[PDB]
Design a protein around this ligand. Structure first.
Ligand code: BVF
Ligand code: BVF
Lengths: 268, 265
């Protein structure tokens, strides 16, 4: 992987692995999400961000600040097959005092065609109190050095899916998978649950017949609260319809919401 | 990745990913196990498989994992390049073996080694069977004919007998279930998941203060998509040793047994 000529975006190629594919011999949406996270880390390192697991700036380190995921939105047109080379381009943009955004474009390395795109929203939080915060002048300034200054958007369309409001699922859910717990392979280097695990947990409550007869086209997931190592999760799904579902992840005990989202599936 | 000049082994380089590392910023033993499985698949493809032989498909036969043994000296750090060399060998009518050597691409030093035993099974009845003359002949074309062993030693750890853990276990992690990311392309539970499940019952203080040096895992029965597993551990021991057992939560049916040796950091 490498930064592009202008130094305002980063590209990386990945060969799709045997263990990364599903029953149709193409990448799962979790493998895609992992590759998006990997190229994001490679970009942060190339532009001088800290290693240590947290991709923080020097001002963030002095003020005990971290980035927290608020939303992940992915749209896939073609999942790469086992052995294929997928090229991913990523870049960041500041969104005033609200937070920051990381966008991605996925391409077939052989044909050069776009096979997917993703967008993510990140908000500032104090690492110790876990209290949300607005982005300060000094953080916005250090972002201007490695972000395009004109808007560059993976989802440019006005009133598109990536910015849509997601409602809260009403009890009773049509489908469910209860008692989901993270194991050591679900944690990141800082022992926090990896963001991609939440996508897996959301999908667990989709019936296997939908997975066998349909392809996932779009997934939009809101992040509200982190699941701890010792927490237990319930994943709920209701068909809202192409097939569409409304999802909700909550703690098995108190019912505390941790995630909400939607998925759109196309018949094969 | 590519076959070596003689065509009797396969090498591949891997860059260690951010999501693949643990608390000390080095590869987990599950990431290593996944890389071992990946280079194995790339070797099989390069020698004409897809992973059965022509005779195996004709007779509805598949390979089933019987044992996995891994020894690590240095876990590669986040961003490092690890080179893995793999090769196969026939073991008469008993089964076959796949061996691995892990090296630091920069220094060229061996940082780990692994060995795996595979037995023949009919895909439909799930009944074990001996390797036939025709299958052994197929293996001769791409396996070294002189013995090449990752674990050469006559009484080494890789061939040791593993006993069954006695109730009550000292440690446990109950109600472990596979999710879709735990399955392979054929919807069978991935071999590496079992390693993760074994380690779940090791206390977090052991993981925080010790490094895994050796893991030996026997495979006895497959966990199905709808099965629930219990993972049990008892300390058998400056080195720490554990005896492990995976069994179904309902039945108590044994699926795996194994041992791990850990060294203090
Ligand atoms: C947006 C948000 C707020 C708080 N905690 C999170 N994990 C995410
Ligand atoms: C060795 C062995 C025997 C039967 N089933 C397995 N999965 C493994």
């Amino acid at each position: 992987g490498s930064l592009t000529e202008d130094g305002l975006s980063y590209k990386e190629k990945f060969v799709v692995r045997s263990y990364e594919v599903g029953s149709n011999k193409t990448a799962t949406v979790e493998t895609i999400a992992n590759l998006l996270q990997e190229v994001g880390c490679n970009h942060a390192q190339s532009v001088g961000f800290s290693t240590d697991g947290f991709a923080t700036t020097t001002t963030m380190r002095k003020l005990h600040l971290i980035w927290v995921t608020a939303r992940m939105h992915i749209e896939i047109y073609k999942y790469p097959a086992w052995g294929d080379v997928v090229e991913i381009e990523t870049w960041c943009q500041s969104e005033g005092r609200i937070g920051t955004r990381r966008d991605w474009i996925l391409k077939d390395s052989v044909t050069g065609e776009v096979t997917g795109r993703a967008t993510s929203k990140w908000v500032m939080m104090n690492q110790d109190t876990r209290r949300l915060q607005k982005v300060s002048d000094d953080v916005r300034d250090e972002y201007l050095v490695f972000c395009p200054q004109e808007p560059r958007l993976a989802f440019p369309e006005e009133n598109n899916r990536s910015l849509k409001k997601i409602p809260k699922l009403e009890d009773p859910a049509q489908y469910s998978m209860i008692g989901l717990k993270p194991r050591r392979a679900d944690l990141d280097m800082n022992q926090h649950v990896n963001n991609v695990t939440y996508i897996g947990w959301v999908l667990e409550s989709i019936p296997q017949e939908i997975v066998d007869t349909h392809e996932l086209q779009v997934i939009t997931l809101d992040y509200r609260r982190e699941c701890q190592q010792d927490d237990v999760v319930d994943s709920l799904t209701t068909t809202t319809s192409d097939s569409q579902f409304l999802h909700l992840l909550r703690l098995s005990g108190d019912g505390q919401e941790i995630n909400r989202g939607t998925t759109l599936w196309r018949k094969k």
